[PDB]
UniProtKB/Swiss-Prot annotation, chain A:
Other known facts: Early fractionation of eukaryotic MCM proteins yielded a variety of dimeric, trimeric and tetrameric complexes with unclear biological significance. The MCM2-7 hexamer is the proposed physiological active complex.
Modified residues (N6-acetyllysine): 116
Protein's recorded name: DNA replication licensing factor MCM5
Localization in the cell: Nucleus; Chromosome
Disease connection: Meier-Gorlin syndrome 8: A form of Meier-Gorlin syndrome, a syndrome characterized by bilateral microtia, aplasia/hypoplasia of the patellae, and severe intrauterine and postnatal growth retardation with short stature and poor weight gain. Additional clinical findings include anomalies of cranial sutures, microcephaly, apparently low-set and simple ears, microstomia, full lips, highly arched or cleft palate, micrognathia, genitourinary tract anomalies, and various skeletal anomalies.
Stated family: Belongs to the MCM family.
Quaternary structure, from the entry: Component of the MCM2-7 complex. The complex forms a toroidal hexameric ring with the proposed subunit order MCM2-MCM6-MCM4-MCM7-MCM3-MCM5. Component of the CMG helicase complex, a hexameric ring of related MCM2-7 subunits stabilized by CDC45 and the tetrameric GINS complex. Interacts with ANKRD17. Interacts with MCMBP. Interacts with TONSL; the interaction is direct.
Domain of life: Eukaryota
From Swiss-Prot, chain C:
Function text: Acts as a component of the MCM2-7 complex (MCM complex) which is the replicative helicase essential for 'once per cell cycle' DNA replication initiation and elongation in eukaryotic cells. Core component of CDC45-MCM-GINS (CMG) helicase, the molecular machine that unwinds template DNA during replication, and around which the replisome is built.
Miscellaneous comment as given in the Swiss-Prot or TrEMBL entry: Early fractionation of eukaryotic MCM proteins yielded a variety of dimeric, trimeric and tetrameric complexes with unclear biological significance. The MCM2-7 hexamer is the proposed physiological active complex.
Family: Belongs to the MCM family.
Protein name stated in the entry: DNA replication licensing factor MCM5
Disease per UniProt entry: Meier-Gorlin syndrome 8: A form of Meier-Gorlin syndrome, a syndrome characterized by bilateral microtia, aplasia/hypoplasia of the patellae, and severe intrauterine and postnatal growth retardation with short stature and poor weight gain. Additional clinical findings include anomalies of cranial sutures, microcephaly, apparently low-set and simple ears, microstomia, full lips, highly arched or cleft palate, micrognathia, genitourinary tract anomalies, and various skeletal anomalies.
Encoding gene per record: MCM5
Subcellular location: Nucleus; Chromosome
Subunit structure: Component of the MCM2-7 complex. The complex forms a toroidal hexameric ring with the proposed subunit order MCM2-MCM6-MCM4-MCM7-MCM3-MCM5. Component of the CMG helicase complex, a hexameric ring of related MCM2-7 subunits stabilized by CDC45 and the tetrameric GINS complex. Interacts with ANKRD17. Interacts with MCMBP. Interacts with TONSL; the interaction is direct.
Curated annotation (Swiss-Prot), chain D:
Organism, scientific name: Homo sapiens
Enzymatic class: hydrolase
Entry's family note: Belongs to the MCM family.
Organism lineage string: Eukaryota, Metazoa, Chordata, Craniata, Vertebrata
EC number: 3.6.4.12
Keyword Transmembrane: no
Residues modified to N-acetylalanine: 1
Protein name from the UniProt record: DNA replication licensing factor MCM3
A GO molecular-function descriptor: DNA binding
Positions contributing to ADP binding: 324, 359-361, 363
Note in the entry: Early fractionation of eukaryotic MCM proteins yielded a variety of dimeric, trimeric and tetrameric complexes with unclear biological significance. The MCM2-7 hexamer is the proposed physiological active complex.
Locations listed in the record: Nucleus; Chromosome
Subunit structure: Component of the MCM2-7 complex. The complex forms a toroidal hexameric ring with the proposed subunit order MCM2-MCM6-MCM4-MCM7-MCM3-MCM5. Component of the CMG helicase complex, a hexameric ring of related MCM2-7 subunits stabilized by CDC45 and the tetrameric GINS complex. Associated with the replication-specific DNA polymerase alpha. Interacts with MCMBP. Interacts with ANKRD17. Interacts with MCM3AP isoform MCM3AP; this interaction leads to MCM3 acetylation.
């Protein structure tokens, strides 16, 4: 058991790959296409670090293009993973528009029951937490009067 | 238990990359980290031990 | 480091661990202590989403 | 015990030698003039240069530096006698005189980190910044008690005497008693000199009379005194005798050649020197170079006026160099201390720590006359958000606690950054509230850059290549020396020169006809001055300020 451990640590002392100047420039052309398809910017930084391991695994004094081919296999799984199961108007406008311009009465639409309203808007109770807890930071006039006065004074 | 591709990732982290000792100010992160997810109910936590 | 129950840890260290995982160093957020230990360790985060 | 000493010869020799030193009769009377000045000004602490003590009697100086308590007491008595000889009435008014030390000390001029236990029971000098204080309470030093029954008077030096020989009541004579004030403060080595690797040292300072109000939290002071231990395990304290103040003000000839405009433009290449591994945002770089420079000292005696403390905010998309730029400035940072996010130690407040009273000076306070780098701005609490507003306006921090009232210098600038909470594009709504920052007070900042990932494929090619080339198979210190030279130069404005610049200021306002212009006149001054500071010119150049106008012009897109 113990023997297999030391072999892994052994290569980490040796090799120590770097960034190839001559070989990367052709590989960069592939990234240009890849960059077309915060997701994009983080990707190159992330992929390059992972690729460095492959050179260490094979005593490679530089990075070859075959390593990128392996990087594709990692992205293949992440492609479905990005679903988490792109739109700007659904996020902010839907919360703002139905706040006051939908229901002027305001009765029965307090904080204890408005969670039910979020169900019709396809918003889970976990997503509203990012919203509900941050509405006081938004400077809403109505929310602060309802939220703070009833917290301890009743 | 566990998918083949998942095991493929594990080796990638253990070897790790290389922290380029830049002369020029701050150096480079050079360290990948993984968030292990997946379906529950298969005693997954014990597997990673 | 194999972190287990990452979602179940205290937030007190969370406000610090965020930078540490990026700058490979832990910082002290007290009034005037500037000591910065070397925290180049990689992270294996296993937790229930 | 009550046993007494009859005419110690060492003490008498010390008294005679010190009196001869003070009796500057053969000389012009430099110290005698100082004695007259102190009598006239109603001050009772004479400061003596140690170098003169070496010059007149080396043995005296050596003994003083090696033995503190008795030598200081004897010298104090000598000063008392000399003052009484010059004027008896002034001496009769006061009880005991005190003596402070100034000048240069060869081996005893140490830093808090260097000040190890080895300097115990020796007079030392400590340099640093104040990190904590307490309020000013009086401590009793000589209590006089009178007993009406026994008609006796009892006096004690330093369990409080409450009972007579036969437990009679004792009503103390307060007027005859003497009380002197007392204050406990602490120090940290300067950020530029204290390594970030190993643990910090804190040294206690006790202030006697005439020193409680001389130093305030957040400034940098020199403390000199006797280093003793109050009673196996002993806690170190430093009883001070003189405190001054600091005022944060061999390659010069190498610098001068760099400043010649005939060869090349130094400003343009200098701007890229600070963000070496960040492609693009060259306009952003010029602003960041501006933030370091700029004047921060005006002839303000006993008051305040317009200042250079204006700061630059950075908002953008994640991993788009928004977080990294702070680090690059932080590294080669002159007089700068990092702080980020919550900072649960009172970011700009003393917080009045209990269970000790300590007043922990905050990040903005400990960073006086520097630049403060702050990351994750929205992470700060609403209290900090409310608090941080007051700092930038008047230039001071006000703290009001239970009895604790304080004045702190806030000569500071801020280079802050925060993610747009959830916003990814942040172009439909005005950033004034879209960046999570709630108040409209954001207009107070100098600049607000937006680094969105606009679909610009031409730039995308250059960004990828720039990362890879950086391996450098085949000039940090240069900028550090630059800022020092500009720190002692005040590139004064010329109204005749400024007029042409000011003419286009209106054209800046008129751009909206075809986000506040009313403050812009303020930022034009600092930015134009910054350009001249790069060239070490004492006069603002028309070309130099013209690039400042363009900086403003592209500042609002």
């Amino acid at each position: 058991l113990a023997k297999l451990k030391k072999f892994i640590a052994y290569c980490r002392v040796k090799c120590g790959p770097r960034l190839s100047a001559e070989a990367a420039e052709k590989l960069k052309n592939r990234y240009i296409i890849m960059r077309s398809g915060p997701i994009t910017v983080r990707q190159l930084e992330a992929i390059v670090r992972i690729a460095e391991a492959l050179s260490k695994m094979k005593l490679q004094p530089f990075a070859t293009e075959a390593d990128v081919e392996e990087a594709l296999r990692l992205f293949q799984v992440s492609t479905l993973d990005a679903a988490l199961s792109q739109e700007d108007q659904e996020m902010l406008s839907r919360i703002e528009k139905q706040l006051k311009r939908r229901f002027a009465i305001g009765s029965q639409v307090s904080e204890h029951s408005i969670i039910k309203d979020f169900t019709k808007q396809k918003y889970p109770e976990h997503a509203i937490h990012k919203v509900l807890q941050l509405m006081l930071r938004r400077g809403e006039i109505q929310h602060r009067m309802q939220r703070k006065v009833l917290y301890r004074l009743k | 238990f566990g998918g083949t591709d998942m095991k493929k990732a594990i080796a990638c982290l253990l070897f790790g990359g290389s922290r380029k000792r830049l002369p020029d100010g701050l150096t480079r992160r050079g360290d990948i980290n993984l968030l292990m997810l997946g379906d529950p109910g298969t005693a997954k936590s014990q597997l990673l031990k | 480091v194999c972190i287990d129950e990452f979602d179940k840890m205290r937030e007190d260290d969370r406000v610090a661990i965020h930078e540490a995982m990026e700058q490979q160093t832990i910082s002290i957020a007290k009034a005037g202590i500037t000591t910065t230990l070397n925290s180049r360790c990689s992270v294996l985060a296993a937790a229930n989403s | 015990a009550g046993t007494v000493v009859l005419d110690d010869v060492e003490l008498r020799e010390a008294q005679r030698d010190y009196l001869d030193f003070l009796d500057d009769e053969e000389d012009q009377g430099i110290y005698q003039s100082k004695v007259r000045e102190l009598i006239s000004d109603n001050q009772y602490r004479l400061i003596v240069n140690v170098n003169d003590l070496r010059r007149k009697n080396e043995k005296r100086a050596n003994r003083l530096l090696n033995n503190a308590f008795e030598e200081l007491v004897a010298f104090q008595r000598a000063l008392k006698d000399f003052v009484a000889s010059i004027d008896a009435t002034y001496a009769k008014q006061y009880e005991e005189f005190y003596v402070g030390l100034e000048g240069s000390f060869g081996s005893k001029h140490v830093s808090p980190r260097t000040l190890t236990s080895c300097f115990l029971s020796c007079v030392v000098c400590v340099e640093g910044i104040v990190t904590k204080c307490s309020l000013v309470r009086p401590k009793v030093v000589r209590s006089v008690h009178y007993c009406p029954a026994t008609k006796k008077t009892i006096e004690r030096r330093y369990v409080y005497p409450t009972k007579d020989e036969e437990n009679n009541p004792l009503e103390t004579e307060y007027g005859l008693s003497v009380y002197k004030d007392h204050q406990t403060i602490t120090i940290q080595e300067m950020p530029e000199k204290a390594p970030a690797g190993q643990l910090p040292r804190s040294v206690d300072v006790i202030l006697d009379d005439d020193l409680v109000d001389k130093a305030k939290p957040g400034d940098r002071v020199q403390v000199v005194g006797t280093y003793r231990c109050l009673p196996g395990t002993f806690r170190t304290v430093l009883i001070a005798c003189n405190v001054k103040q600091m005022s944060k003000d061999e390659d010069i000839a190498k610098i001068k050649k760099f400043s010649k405009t005939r060869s090349k433009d130094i400003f343009d290449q200098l701007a890229k020197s600070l963000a070496p591994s960040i492609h693009g945002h060259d306009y952003v770089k010029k602003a960041i170079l501006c933030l370091l420079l700029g004047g921060v000292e005006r002839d303000l005696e006993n008051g305040s006026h317009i200042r250079g403390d204006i700061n630059i905010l950075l908002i953008g998309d994640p991993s788009v160099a928004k977080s990294q730029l702070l680090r690059y400035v932080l590294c080669t940072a002159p007089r700068a201390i990092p702080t980020t996010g919550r900072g649960s130690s009172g970011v700009g407040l003393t917080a009045a720590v209990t269970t000790d009273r300590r007043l922990e000076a905050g990040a903005m306070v400990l960073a006086d006359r520097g630049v403060v780098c702050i990351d994750e701005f929205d992470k700060m609490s609403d209290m900090d958000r409310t608090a941080i507003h007051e700092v930038m306006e008047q230039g001071r921090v006000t703290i009001a606690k239970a009895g604790i009232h304080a004045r702190l210098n806030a000569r500071c600038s801020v280079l802050a950054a925060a993610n747009p909470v959830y916003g990814r594009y942040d172009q439909y709504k005005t950033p004034m509230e879209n960046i999570g920052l709630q108040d409209s007070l954001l207009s107070r900042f100098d600049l607000l850059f937006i680094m969105l990932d606009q679909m610009d494929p031409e730039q995308d090619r250059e960004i990828s290549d720039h990362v890879l080339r950086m391996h450098r198979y085949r000039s940090a210190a240069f900028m550090k020396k630059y800022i020092h030279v500009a720190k002692i130069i005040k590139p004064v404005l010329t109204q005749e020169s400024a007029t042409y610049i000011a003419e286009e200021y209106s054209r800046l306002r008129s751009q909206d006809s075809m986000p506040v212009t009313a403050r812009t006149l303020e930022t034009l001054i600092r930015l134009a001055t910054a350009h001249a500071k790069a060239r070490m010119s004492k006069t603002v150049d028309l070309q130099d300020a013209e690039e400042a106008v363009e900086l403003v012009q592209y500042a609002y897109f």
